[PDB]
Design a protein around this ligand. Structure first.
Ligand SMILES: CN1CCN(c2ccc(-c3cnc4[nH]cc(NC(=O)c5cccnc5)c4c3)cc2)CC1
Lengths: 271, 5
């Protein structure tokens, strides 16, 4: 069918040092996809980096992960064709100092756990989960995006401990700031707990999880009459108490988050 | 701006 491979770039979806993502609409079918555009000339290692990110994206196929359709190289430019999520970023559904309705946060939290369980099941950790990277489709289904920091932590049934310091400070687990090596899975569980805090309170609990940060010390001392905790009902707060545990070995795992009381409370009506 | 598939 002539022209079915032509796509018009009609809108900037996102921009950053990594490059940009544009909304692409098919010339013939008007199908919409997002196209991430990367100039491999921007950094000496961008070549290996983007190659790794495409490798990882090729391994993924889950309803709560941004689908990867393929890629094309044009000289120094790499074009990644990705699932377009018309509801934009979860970031923009979080009202400052309010958050969002608890049942809505619970449904987004269920979908985030589903995508994270999927990734960990195939041995991939994301390493930078935050609202800016959790996208929404036309029906508000959540899809994890941006595997630019993703890496394999399990291969051939053997776990590799991680040591790279990466992520975003307000969402990063405390063991990355205190230990030379750490397990991957608890770090992604932690950032999911900060995302839940933001969805239910509309504010991040601390600049970083270190004793030097007063807000983090206050949490460790269970001062839950202070914000953001005072804004969170008791049932989800009990779940946050299990997720935001400094020792990653005592931190709740996803199979136990799935058994949590708040997690299983009927709260949200179907669309 | 455009791209081919
Ligand atoms: C106010 N205005 C703010 C922006 N909104 C807004 C609306 C839609 C989208 C958006 C939509 N679909 C997408 N598919 C893949 C994306 N990004 C990626 O895969 C990706 C991104 C960075 C690095 N690596 C990968 C992506 C981003 C973003 C923002 C629209 C409303």
């Amino acid at each position: 069918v002539p022209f079915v491979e032509d796509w018009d770039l009609v809108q900037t979806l996102g921009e950053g040092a990594y490059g940009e993502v544009q909304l692409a609409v098919n010339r013939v079918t008007e199908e919409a996809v997002a196209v991430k555009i990367v100039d491999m000339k921007r950094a000496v290692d961008c070549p290996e980096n983007i190659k790794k990110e495409i490798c990882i994206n090729a391994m993924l196929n889950h309803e709560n992960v941004v689908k990867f359709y393929g890629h094309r190289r044009e000289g120094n430019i790499q074009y990644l064709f990705l699932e377009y999520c018309s509801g934009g970023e979860l970031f923009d559904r979080i009202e400052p100092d309010i958050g969002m309705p608890e049942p809505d946060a619970q449904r987004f939290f269920h979908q985030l756990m589903a995508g994270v369980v999927y990734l960990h099941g195939i041995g991939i950790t994301h390493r930078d989960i935050k609202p800016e990277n959790l996208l929404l489709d036309e029906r508000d289904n959540l899809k994890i995006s941006d595997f630019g920091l993703a890496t394999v932590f399990r291969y051939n049934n053997r776990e590799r401990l991680l040591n790279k310091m990466c992520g975003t400070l307000p969402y990063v687990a405390p063991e990355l700031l205190k230990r030379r090596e750490f397990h991957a899975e608890p770090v992604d569980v932690w950032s999911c707990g900060i995302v839940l805090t933001a969805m239910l309170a509309g504010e991040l609990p601390w600049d970083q999880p270190s004793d030097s940060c007063q807000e983090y010390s206050d949490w460790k001392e269970k001062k839950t009459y202070l914000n953001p905790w005072k804004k969170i009902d008791s049932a989800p707060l009990a779940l946050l108490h299990k997720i935001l545990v400094e020792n990653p070995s005592a931190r709740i795992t996803i199979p136990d988050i799935k058994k949590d009381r708040w997690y299983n409370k009927p709260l949200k009506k179907g669309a | 701006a455009s791209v081919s598939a």
